[PDB]
Design a protein around this ligand. Sequence first.
Ligand SMILES: C=CCc1ccc(O)c(-c2ccc(O)c(CC=C)c2)c1
Ligand SMILES: [Zn+2]
Lengths: 5, 272
Amino acid sequence: QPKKX
Amino acid sequence: GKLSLQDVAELIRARACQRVVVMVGAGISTPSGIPDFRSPGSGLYSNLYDLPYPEAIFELPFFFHNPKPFFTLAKELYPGNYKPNVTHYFLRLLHDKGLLLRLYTQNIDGLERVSGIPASKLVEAHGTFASATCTVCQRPFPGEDIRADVMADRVPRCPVCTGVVKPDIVFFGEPLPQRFLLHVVDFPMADLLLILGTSLEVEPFASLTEAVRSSVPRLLINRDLVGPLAWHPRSRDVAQLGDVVHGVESLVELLGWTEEMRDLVQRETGKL
Ligand SMILES: C=CCc1ccc(O)c(-c2ccc(O)c(CC=C)c2)c1
Ligand SMILES: [Zn+2]
């Protein structure tokens, strides 16, 4: 899942 | 030839735009008195144990070493400390009128929820104080269960494993919430993008302004013009620059919603 930042 | 704020108001009022996606940030929190913790010159980094740099407050490695700085902010932001403002109630009216496809928030103050917008319409991209998770055994907790600890400046400990119980705020390097990825269906479906009170500096959230279709208006209500919109402007962009509350108030006026706003706010105040 895509990361903060 | 550019669209005006009034043009966009008329599209909304006519339901020509009726699938509105909204992106919000700290500019809608500060009118409620929320600390401007995204600003390194916030008086917060005057309070703050010994913090090496502001971003450490949302870094897991730092948190495990010293979670007191984060919990100071948690105490500050915990449910009940702050009330939604007219910007939030504007968004709640958009929902009530059947115009809100989704509201994406970078804020962690929970004011969108408290305004009464149902969870189905919200993407809390940076998590929530409504719930917490033990950092060791992964046990979930309602936020009320650690409230007394947080308000007493105690680090909440898990009753199972004594791990620290961490509010469900997304820290740097953690997966964004599952619901973030709704952007892949919501932005292409939007018929209007509203960008309210965000500098569009926190990635990857800021890059979603490009994910609406090329023909869809993008309305920015913000003190300043933000790079993502400005770097790559589109023909139906509109910028209402100035204080975010005065901008929303102007839009509410053009929409003809002043009375409905008053009714809503009057109805909701008791609850808080
Ligand atoms: C009397 C003091 C009030 C005062 C004056 C200027 C500020 O920046 C802040 C402030 C804003 C955001 C923050 O996050 C914090 C930190 C918490 C104390 C302070 C407050
Ligand atoms: Zn535990």
